[PDB]
Every structure is written in C-alpha cells, then in structure tokens.
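Weekly sync notes, structure subgroup
Attendees: PM, AL, DS (notes)

Item 1: joint prediction request from the bench team. They want all two components modeled as one assembly rather than separately. Inputs as received:
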Amino acid sequence: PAMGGFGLKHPPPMMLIKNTPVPGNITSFSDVPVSSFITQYSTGQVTVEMEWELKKENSKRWNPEIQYTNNYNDPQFVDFAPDSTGEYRTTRPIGTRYLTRPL
Amino acid sequence: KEVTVQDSTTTIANNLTSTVQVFTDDDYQLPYVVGNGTEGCLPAFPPQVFTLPQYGYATLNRDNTENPTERSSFFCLEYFPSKMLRTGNNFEFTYNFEEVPFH
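Output from the run, pasted for the record:
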C-alpha cells in the first residue's frame, strides 16, 4: 500500500453493527412500511487482541545506534499524556526506522 | 615470515610460533564487498601467486561531503569469533547455494 502497512488479499473482515428498530405506536394497518420508531442508541465495550511476530536485531555494529528517545527542552507539558483539561496530546510522529543495517 | 631490516640487509626468516586468524561471515553482518567487480580474485592461471586484497568499506557520509552521519556505522572485525592457525593448522568451510534459475 502507498500509505503504508501490509497489503492483504483477505484482510481482517469488516465488523458491522446496527440498532434493531423498535416501532412507535401504530394503531392501524397500512401496507406502507413503518416510518415511526423509538429513537435509541447503544453502547458497550470492544476488546481486540492481536499477535505479532518479531524479527530479532542481529548486528555486529560496534558503536551505539540511534534510538527513539523522549527529549524536549523546557517542556511545559509531557507529550503523549493528557493535558490540564484532559485532552490527550501527541506532539510528534513516531516511525519504525532507527536501527541501522548494511546493504 | 618475519622480515627485519638492519642497514639495508632486509633478511627474512619464518616465525614458527606466529598465528593467522580466519573467520567466515555466515550471518551477513558485515558490509559485503565481493560482488562489486573489483580486483583481488584467485588468478586465472594456476601457477600465479596473488596477494589478498585489503578489506574496507564505505558507510554513510553527510551532504555529499567527506564527513559522517549519525547513522555511519563502525564494524570491528575482531568482534567476530575467528579461528587461529599456526603452521600445522588448516581451515575448512562448506556452503550450499540457494535455489536459483539456470543461466
């Protein structure tokens, strides 16, 4: 994929959900469908569990490498934590390429 | 063979106690300089004696200059386990090519 990640012929399926309709008060017979419903919403919890396979880093580089570090000069807040209002703050993007390898 | 120079006599003697070190890089952890079309192969003609080439590599440089980067890596070749050989010792290695198409 151009945006990134793993191209999959059969990716994780789509999981679709709706609220079943509950009609309002209907006192008569009509052959047109019921358009009057009780307004309602639903809530709940969803847990996802993924398993990942890892590739060990096996390298003979002598000197230290570049690491992703938490580094800020005079921080007024901590990054990747809630704000004083409760709003979660992420200042910078984090990619995967840090360790170095020869061609 | 130990070589010594006194007032331009340049004598040569053989050191029977001296060692040579040999290792093969099985995990491909060093920069691989071989397939790049450079000199130092075994001669075409069997009687010919040849010098072994010096090992070296180029890492990342910065801004098309001679200066390094933070991702410039140093590989120490002493940090591989190697086999030490005196006069009576020998070294042996075996390799199986992976499946490729016929030329």
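Discussion: The first strand of chain B starts at residue 2 and ends at 4.
Action: AL to compare against the crosslinking data before next sync.
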